[PDB]
Design an enzyme around this catalytic site. Structure first.
Site, PDB file in Angstrom:
ATOM      1  N   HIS A  16       0.988 -16.371   1.647  1.00 41.37           N
ATOM      2  CA  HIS A  16      -0.054 -16.762   0.691  1.00 41.37           C
ATOM      3  C   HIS A  16       0.386 -16.778  -0.775  1.00 41.37           C
ATOM      4  O   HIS A  16      -0.456 -16.941  -1.662  1.00 41.37           O
ATOM      5  CB  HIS A  16      -1.275 -15.853   0.826  1.00 41.37           C
ATOM      6  CG  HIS A  16      -1.908 -15.888   2.171  1.00 41.37           C
ATOM      7  ND1 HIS A  16      -2.941 -16.746   2.485  1.00 41.37           N
ATOM      8  CD2 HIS A  16      -1.662 -15.166   3.289  1.00 41.37           C
ATOM      9  CE1 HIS A  16      -3.301 -16.555   3.741  1.00 41.37           C
ATOM     10  NE2 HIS A  16      -2.541 -15.600   4.251  1.00 41.37           N
TER      11      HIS A  16
ATOM     12  N   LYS B 240     -12.458 -17.046 -10.653  1.00 42.22           N
ATOM     13  CA  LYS B 240     -11.310 -16.693  -9.829  1.00 42.22           C
ATOM     14  C   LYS B 240     -10.746 -15.429 -10.466  1.00 42.22           C
ATOM     15  O   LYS B 240     -11.095 -15.110 -11.609  1.00 42.22           O
ATOM     16  CB  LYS B 240     -10.270 -17.816  -9.832  1.00 42.22           C
ATOM     17  CG  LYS B 240      -9.659 -18.138 -11.205  1.00 42.22           C
ATOM     18  CD  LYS B 240      -9.347 -19.614 -11.379  1.00 42.22           C
ATOM     19  CE  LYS B 240      -8.638 -20.191 -10.203  1.00 42.22           C
ATOM     20  NZ  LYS B 240      -9.235 -21.459  -9.736  1.00 42.22           N
ATOM     21  N   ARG B 241      -9.890 -14.717  -9.748  1.00 42.98           N
ATOM     22  CA  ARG B 241      -9.301 -13.508 -10.307  1.00 42.98           C
ATOM     23  C   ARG B 241      -8.516 -13.851 -11.586  1.00 42.98           C
ATOM     24  O   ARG B 241      -7.991 -14.960 -11.727  1.00 42.98           O
ATOM     25  CB  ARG B 241      -8.422 -12.799  -9.272  1.00 42.98           C
ATOM     26  CG  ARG B 241      -9.208 -12.148  -8.135  1.00 42.98           C
ATOM     27  CD  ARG B 241      -9.991 -10.932  -8.610  1.00 42.98           C
ATOM     28  NE  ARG B 241      -9.087  -9.883  -9.081  1.00 42.98           N
ATOM     29  CZ  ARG B 241      -8.690  -8.842  -8.353  1.00 42.98           C
ATOM     30  NH1 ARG B 241      -9.142  -8.673  -7.115  1.00 42.98           N
ATOM     31  NH2 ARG B 241      -7.849  -7.947  -8.883  1.00 42.98           N
TER      32      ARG B 241
ATOM     33  N   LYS C 224      -3.028 -18.528 -13.293  1.00 43.30           N
ATOM     34  CA  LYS C 224      -4.258 -19.302 -13.141  1.00 43.30           C
ATOM     35  C   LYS C 224      -4.696 -19.874 -14.487  1.00 43.30           C
ATOM     36  O   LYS C 224      -5.563 -20.722 -14.539  1.00 43.30           O
ATOM     37  CB  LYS C 224      -5.368 -18.450 -12.522  1.00 43.30           C
ATOM     38  CG  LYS C 224      -5.120 -18.086 -11.063  1.00 43.30           C
ATOM     39  CD  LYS C 224      -6.162 -17.073 -10.574  1.00 43.30           C
ATOM     40  CE  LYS C 224      -5.924 -16.625  -9.151  1.00 43.30           C
ATOM     41  NZ  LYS C 224      -6.188 -17.729  -8.177  1.00 43.30           N
TER      42      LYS C 224
ATOM     43  N   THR D 259      -8.874 -21.910  -2.940  1.00 44.22           N
ATOM     44  CA  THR D 259      -9.976 -22.257  -2.055  1.00 44.22           C
ATOM     45  C   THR D 259     -11.251 -22.427  -2.861  1.00 44.22           C
ATOM     46  O   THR D 259     -12.155 -23.152  -2.452  1.00 44.22           O
ATOM     47  CB  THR D 259     -10.187 -21.220  -0.960  1.00 44.22           C
ATOM     48  OG1 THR D 259     -10.286 -19.929  -1.554  1.00 44.22           O
ATOM     49  CG2 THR D 259      -9.036 -21.232   0.032  1.00 44.22           C
TER      50      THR D 259
ATOM     51  N   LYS E 289     -14.568 -25.220  -2.596  1.00 44.69           N
ATOM     52  CA  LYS E 289     -15.973 -24.855  -2.686  1.00 44.69           C
ATOM     53  C   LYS E 289     -16.697 -25.743  -3.697  1.00 44.69           C
ATOM     54  O   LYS E 289     -17.791 -26.212  -3.420  1.00 44.69           O
ATOM     55  CB  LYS E 289     -16.160 -23.378  -3.053  1.00 44.69           C
ATOM     56  CG  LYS E 289     -15.565 -22.379  -2.057  1.00 44.69           C
ATOM     57  CD  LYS E 289     -15.456 -21.012  -2.683  1.00 44.69           C
ATOM     58  CE  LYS E 289     -14.553 -20.094  -1.871  1.00 44.69           C
ATOM     59  NZ  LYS E 289     -14.484 -18.750  -2.512  1.00 44.69           N
TER      60      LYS E 289
HETATM   61  C1  LIG Z   1      -3.092  -5.044  -2.945  1.00 49.56           C
HETATM   62  C2  LIG Z   1      -2.864  -6.531  -2.811  1.00 49.56           C
HETATM   63  C3  LIG Z   1      -1.566  -7.054  -2.702  1.00 49.56           C
HETATM   64  C4  LIG Z   1      -1.373  -8.434  -2.582  1.00 49.56           C
HETATM   65  C5  LIG Z   1      -2.477  -9.291  -2.592  1.00 49.56           C
HETATM   66  C6  LIG Z   1      -2.283 -10.751  -2.443  1.00 49.56           C
HETATM   67  N1  LIG Z   1      -3.223 -11.587  -2.588  1.00 49.56           N
HETATM   68  N2  LIG Z   1      -2.951 -12.787  -2.423  1.00 49.56           N
HETATM   69  C7  LIG Z   1      -3.814 -13.798  -2.537  1.00 49.56           C
HETATM   70  S1  LIG Z   1      -5.473 -13.593  -2.959  1.00 49.56           S
HETATM   71  N3  LIG Z   1      -3.290 -15.004  -2.328  1.00 49.56           N
HETATM   72  C8  LIG Z   1      -4.134 -16.188  -2.393  1.00 49.56           C
HETATM   73  O1  LIG Z   1      -4.364 -16.586  -1.029  1.00 49.56           O
HETATM   74  C9  LIG Z   1      -5.209 -17.725  -0.889  1.00 49.56           C
HETATM   75  C10 LIG Z   1      -5.441 -17.976   0.600  1.00 49.56           C
HETATM   76  O2  LIG Z   1      -4.302 -18.584   1.231  1.00 49.56           O
HETATM   77  C11 LIG Z   1      -4.621 -18.925  -1.656  1.00 49.56           C
HETATM   78  O3  LIG Z   1      -5.558 -20.004  -1.688  1.00 49.56           O
HETATM   79  C12 LIG Z   1      -4.291 -18.559  -3.103  1.00 49.56           C
HETATM   80  O4  LIG Z   1      -3.631 -19.678  -3.699  1.00 49.56           O
HETATM   81  C13 LIG Z   1      -3.411 -17.304  -3.144  1.00 49.56           C
HETATM   82  O5  LIG Z   1      -3.087 -16.913  -4.485  1.00 49.56           O
HETATM   83  C14 LIG Z   1      -3.769  -8.768  -2.685  1.00 49.56           C
HETATM   84  C15 LIG Z   1      -3.960  -7.392  -2.810  1.00 49.56           C
END
Ligand SMILES: Cc1ccc(/C=N/NC(=S)N[C@@H]2O[C@H](CO)[C@@H](O)[C@H](O)[C@H]2O)cc1
Ligand SMILES: Cc1ccc(/C=N/NC(=S)N[C@@H]2O[C@H](CO)[C@@H](O)[C@H](O)[C@H]2O)cc1
Ligand SMILES: Cc1ccc(/C=N/NC(=S)N[C@@H]2O[C@H](CO)[C@@H](O)[C@H](O)[C@H]2O)cc1
Ligand SMILES: Cc1ccc(/C=N/NC(=S)N[C@@H]2O[C@H](CO)[C@@H](O)[C@H](O)[C@H]2O)cc1
Lengths: 811, 811
Positions: free
Chosen positions: B352, B543-544, B549, B651, B655
């Protein structure tokens, strides 16, 4: 099956069955193919609890409409045990549920065994609170039990290699079907901080806040449709609490929630532990806000004492007194004298012991840090109280230092018992002799100052749990002759006196006991793999392990019988099964040694081929309310053998008397009243009276004198010393021998000869089954006084100023 | 009221009402006089959940009978949000419950607002898991989500003085009506200990044991009567744990239970924290035992991969690979090669992200202490894998060090991504461009070794939550023209293309948006006391908060518009409400500064009289799933402006597209596919492509060049530096300016000119409502590809080897 268990009507059985299947499906998310036995218990628990709700809602609605004086029973302990059967009993649902479950293909008794005890108490004081709640509901009083919802109740006791091992009593693990969380009544409790004095009086500021979240548990009265509430507080961190660092902050929420985590099991020795003080304040602060909230939802605090009684169950919630003062003075702005008047008239204190090491004496420095405003209020109470003492007893400077709430010394301490007496309109002991000992010795100074405050309220036990529930056979044969009224009017048991010569009744009483003994003999084989003779005399001592309760004296007797057998193996002796059970406080080294001694004795005695099945010694593991419900009905002989002056009341004693065991005991606590009710001829009384103990203390107790003059006692000690009961560790019991010989506060040797002789008279009577049973009948018939309904009616009339009512609420 | 919300039949409404009153009475122990709004929510939640149980029991029974291949979706995050409305939607109960509650005198929407979000995720990866579960249920797959039941989900964000403050998300405080504890499936998980090598292979001994207790949550499919299970593990101490000292031992139980206490919120920077590793192992160990148990309840592990698929949601549950090996080798005694074969065929890995600071690289010394046997298995996997690499690429020594699971350095680390690729039969990225970037750059070596493993599965969102639930008005006007089939077959939205010139439909689409914007404008006034113009363009970025971003790029634009207004105040500008929302990871200093900047910009802009209501900047506090459900339908413009190559998929983008917002975005992640589906003319694409970024990196990114050549950018920076947006603290934003000027990894300035220009084209189009709406229609009509039903059907066919089925289970 049996009449006192209620009707099993067609319509009720059908409805119970359908509601049982509804809960299995919708509540437990199971069908019959995947259901565990625990699922079946919960389906039943949910089915039964459904019957409480209308009654509970309308009982509480009733109190709001009628606005009676409310009784608040404050305890840190409520030793409730199991709730399922109790609820069925009080709702008359037992036979119906039995039938309903039977038709569903289930054994209800097996289901009942799955319920965990609510073990939120240590022993007698906690069980007293539980019996009291039951009696208050049965007597139609507007009563609330308030305490702490401990995540962990009294530890489960395991015996490993003869030694007590403690494990966490994780009683909530599967969820408690008997509680309703009440989050909307969550209240803040304050800790630490500091006092600011302003123009507008004192202000308690900069405090840490812990949330108190109530859980309500129903307390159903006996067939009167009354359902009272037991409200237990759980500690919750506020959400901004402590807020890498983020993670830790969230984890540290545990610190605040530790307050309600665990019941302190040290019923032997007061420890000034801060967490314990937090628990005492926590239950007091939350409860008082809840009381005041309810009082207001009806400015004028003059009427507070007309609408509110707070019973302090020992000194553990003694902080109610300065907390009430704090709210009245600092938050409601009442003047001191009016606030005090209100406080005194509101509060009453019940003392449950005279052992000085058990008295709460909190270090001043602890109160200073934790509850700075309360310390100030306590100092102020002390000053004004001591001004009263000075005025009544001019020049008596020693009286002043003896009566002070503040004890000077190495660490300054607050005497919480002195606080309770000063701040209460009534102070009671828990048996006539105990209440007299309070007036004559430990609270003598206070009695001389305010004689009107001192009362007796002899303890009681609920005949619902302690007869109907645990001993249906006995309840039934009694109901056959005298009807069912005695269940909520235990004095009616006197009518059984005219059956003392009734051959059928004698046969029935003896048969019920025999059936009870058989069932318990089975229970011991099934769950513990131990084989006993059900034709032996069941000699039982069950209660917490304490030196004062003298399990050791019982031990000496056991060994004497063993030695006598070994001496003349071919002489007839009345066979005995001697059962001793009880938990030791984890830090009480002597009590743990006593348990080990008991098992070590069993190890020798139970495997001696010459003994046969004439003598068996069994330690009853994990003694608790649900185990008492099994063993008490099976007992023939109740050991109540505390050194005279030490057992404030005892209540185990009353349970045994009600259930057809004869009592061997000292004139101690409620034994005195039990013997008086039954007549001394129907009791096995032995040993020093209080006066004899006092005489002995004046001369000085010399254990050696007894060791030198009693060869049978010498032999026992020698056997203990030389390693007869610990062959691989010859000195294992040197602590016990040393204590017995040189520092026995409880004079075990002084009562030894009389105890053994009295025990011979027990064996003699048991040889004659007919006369044994007639004496039993005479005990049961006179056990009426020891109903907690009587105790509670006395509290209500003489302390709380409210009339009990046996009248039904509409169903 | 509206058709897609189902039938409100007479019989159903009556039954819902009676069951609602039953639950209020029997479950909540309340009547209408004392009921709080929260009680009403719970009565409704219990009423609705009743409808799940038969379906849930029979779905699970069905799987046992038919024995299909089971899909195990392993995630440390399931960002579920609220469950009540979702359940009603999928059961077709919405109108009925609405009616039923209406007749009871209640507003169901007000009741829905009381439910806490299950916030067991951070952002996109967690929400993906949730959408996936919904699609798997809807597609009739035998699928189980497995994760951790965190006591505390993602923190609630508060904004104080413009700064983010975190508070504990105590989401379970009132109890979760959607879960069923499953204590009979409690499993031990082992930690620490040591490895003994015997004749009979390795043995993992002397371990600490934490219990894993499962909680089952229903996952209802869309109107197909399928109810799948999400099983979340909670950590429980065993009862002999740690067993003064007694008290502490009981208190220390918290240590073991800390494992499931809190969700790690650091989605920005991998921290090798031990508690996080414990959580990863905890969910993996418990899940694998549960999988194997279920597999056996049908010796021959050859068929394991035919009956089991495990999807690894990123590397967080990567320990599944050596844990499966451990069980197969050490406990089942399979040979290594056969165990490995089984493992590879069972596991698949979804990546991801490409941000290197987000990759899990666990210190060897941590694995050594915590999971000694797993480290050994990992070393063994590495050796055999590197033997394969050596053989395929003889002499390529650098390939060997690049591909190693073990990274040498200061601290030796395990590369968990390398572990996942080696141990999985499939590896997929989450958008076409992302999957290509994996093949071409970060996993290039692995792709060259095993090209067959690498796949794409473009992300999706569930149209149930993300259209029907949050946007009933839009769902309804669509259903009016094309029927209801599109809800579980989103491609059917293409049919809307023949309505692009339909005047009525244009009017309806524009009216739905207007109604959504009005409702959200109201929500902002009611709950947050802020007043916005509903006729403005709703410009939203939610978004976060991350540098990649580029919320900062949005900030620069906002300031440009502000400066242009201030320059020519009397020139017409299309009014905008610019809304930025999102949480910052608590330790991410730059992200917290960005939030502060946003609020500081709002402080200046929202109070400039010259601006009027032409420009408003609002920071959306506590962005979370339930807030996304409100803001997304109200949005006109979706900001998807990550530096090309950085957003794996996104994502949120999908939406917004589904809900009638136009997208301004870079060719990054799934934007590329969105633009391809809609046609580039119906998208506002700007900025560097991936190739342009790469070119820039080769030359070297010089932010100064942009600052020197763009006077509008210079002005903004000068304003930031000089304290224009922080008058009392002039240097407050020096970190941001410094980062932008000297160390901007994400090339904010490089896209500035094109972004601003593209933003002018947005304003131009919005001036022409008819053409704005026609473009919107063209987006909605082509958003079909981005249904997670499509994504899941691709996983099922191309990775898991199972056929989806749209067929109903019998009701
Ligand atoms: C503690 C911790 C450590 C690592 C993470 C990683 N978190 N990782 C994310 S929320 N990855 C997201 O995944 C989505 C679904 O595929 C993508 O659409 C998006 O582009 C991507 O950034 C979250 C929490
Ligand atoms: C007598 C009586 C009648 C009705 C009720 C209703 N009870 N209704 C609820 S929702 N009880 C909850 O149930 C959970 C059990 O798993 C507990 O953990 C929780 O503390 C308790 O509040 C409770 C007692
Ligand atoms: C932590 C802690 C500290 C102190 C205690 C005190 N526990 N105190 C008890 S259990 N007192 C008992 O009370 C019974 C009821 O009146 C009497 O029958 C009995 O004689 C008396 O000993 C228990 C726990
Ligand atoms: C969909 C569905 C259907 C039925 C059920 C049944 N649920 N039945 C019980 S008893 N649920 C319990 O309820 C408590 C709520 O206060 C929780 O704290 C506890 O974790 C949960 O197991 C759960 C979900």
């Amino acid at each position: 099956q049996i009449s006192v268990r209620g009707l099993a009507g067609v319509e009720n059985v059908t409805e119970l069955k359908k509601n049982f299947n509804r809960h299995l499906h919708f509540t437990l998310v199971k069908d019959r193919n995947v259901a565990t036995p625990r699922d079946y218990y919960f389906a039943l628990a949910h089915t039964v609890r459904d019957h409480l709700v209308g009654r509970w809602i309308r009982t509480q609605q009733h109190y709001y409409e009628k606005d009676p004086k409310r009784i608040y029973y404050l305890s840190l302990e409520f030793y409730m045990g199991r709730t399922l059967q109790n609820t069925m009993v009080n709702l008359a649902l037992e036979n119906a549920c039995d039938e309903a479950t039977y038709q569903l293909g289930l054994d209800m008794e097996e289901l009942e065994e799955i319920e965990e005890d609510a073990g939120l108490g240590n022993g007698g004081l906690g069980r007293l609170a539980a019996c009291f709640l039951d009696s208050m509901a049965t007597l139609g009083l507007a009563a609330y039990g308030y305490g702490i919802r401990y995540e962990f109740g009294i530890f489960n006791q395991k015996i490993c290699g003869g030694w007590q091992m403690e494990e966490a009593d994780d009683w909530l693990r599967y969820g408690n079907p008997w509680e309703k969380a009440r989050p909307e009544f969550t209240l803040p409790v304050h800790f630490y901080g500091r006092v600011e004095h302003t123009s507008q009086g004192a202000k308690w500021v900069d405090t840490q806040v812990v949330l108190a979240m109530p859980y309500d548990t129903p307390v159903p009265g006996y067939r009167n449709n009354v359902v009272n509430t037991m409200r237990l507080w759980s500690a919750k961190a506020p959400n901004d609490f402590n807020l890498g660092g983020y993670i830790q902050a969230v984890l540290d929420r545990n610190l605040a929630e530790n307050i309600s985590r665990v019941l302190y099991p040290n019923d032997n020795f007061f420890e000034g532990k801060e967490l314990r003080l937090k628990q005492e304040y926590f239950v007091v602060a939350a409860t008082l806000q809840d009381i005041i909230r309810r009082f207001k939802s009806s400015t004028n605090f003059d009427a507070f004492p007309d609408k509110v009684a707070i019973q302090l169950n020992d000194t553990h919630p003694s902080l109610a007194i300065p907390e009430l003062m704090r709210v009245l003075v600092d938050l409601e702005r009442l003047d001191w004298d009016k606030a005090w008047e209100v406080t005194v008239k509101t509060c009453a204190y019940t003392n449950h012991t005279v052992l000085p090491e058990a008295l709460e004496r909190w270090p001043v420095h602890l109160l200073e840090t934790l509850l700075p405003r309360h310390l100030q209020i306590i100092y102020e109470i002390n000053q004004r109280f001591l001004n009263r003492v000075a005025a009544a007893f001019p020049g008596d400077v020693d009286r002043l230092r003896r009566m002070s709430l503040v004890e000077e010394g190495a660490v300054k301490r607050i005497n919480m018992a002195h606080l309770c007496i000063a701040g209460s309109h009534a102070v009671n002991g828990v048996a006539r002799i105990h209440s007299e000992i309070l007036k004559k010795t430990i609270f003598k100074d206070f009695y001389e100052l305010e004689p009107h405050k001192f009362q007796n309220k002899t303890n009681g036990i609920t005949p619902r749990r302690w007869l109907v529930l645990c001993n249906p056979g006995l309840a039934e044969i009694i109901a056959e002759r005298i009807g069912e009224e005695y269940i909520s009017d235990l004095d009616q048991l006197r009518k059984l006196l005219s059956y003392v010569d009734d051959e059928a009744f004698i046969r029935d009483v003896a048969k019920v006991k025999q059936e009870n003994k058989l069932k318990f003999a089975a229970y011991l084989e099934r769950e513990y793999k131990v084989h006993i003779n059900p034709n032996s005399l069941f000699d039982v001592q069950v209660k917490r392990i304490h030196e004062y309760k003298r399990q050791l004296l019982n031990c000496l007797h056991v060994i004497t019988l063993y030695n006598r057998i070994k001496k003349e193996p071919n002489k007839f002796v009345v066979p005995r099964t001697v059962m001793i059970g009880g938990k030791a406080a984890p830090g009480y080294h002597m009590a743990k040694m006593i348990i080990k001694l008991i098992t070590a004795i069993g190890d020798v005695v139970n495997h001696d081929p010459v003994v046969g099945d004439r003598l068996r010694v069994i330690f009853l593991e994990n003694y608790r309310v649900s185990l008492a419900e099994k063993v008490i009905p099976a007992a023939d002989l109740s050991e109540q053998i505390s050194t005279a002056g030490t057992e404030a009341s005892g209540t185990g004693n009353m349970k045994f008397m009600l259930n057809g065991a004869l009592t061997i005991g000292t004139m101690d606590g409620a034994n005195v009243e039990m013997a008086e009710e039954a007549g001394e001829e129907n009791f096995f009384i032995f040993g020093m009276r209080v006066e004899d103990v006092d005489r002995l203390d004046q001369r000085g107790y010399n254990a050696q004198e007894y060791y030198d003059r009693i060869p049978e006692l010498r032999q026992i000690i020698e056997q203990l010393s030389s390693g007869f009961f610990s062959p691989k560790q010859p000195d294992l019991f040197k602590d016990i021998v040393n204590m017995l010989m040189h520092h026995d506060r409880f004079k075990v040797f002084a009562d030894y000869e009389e105890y053994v002789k009295c025990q011979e008279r027990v064996s003699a009577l048991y040889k004659n089954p007919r006369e044994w049973t007639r004496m039993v009948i005479r005990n049961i018939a006179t056990s009426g006084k020891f109903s907690s309904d009587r105790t509670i009616a006395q509290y209500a009339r003489e302390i709380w100023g409210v009339e009990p009512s046996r009248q039904r609420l509409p169903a």
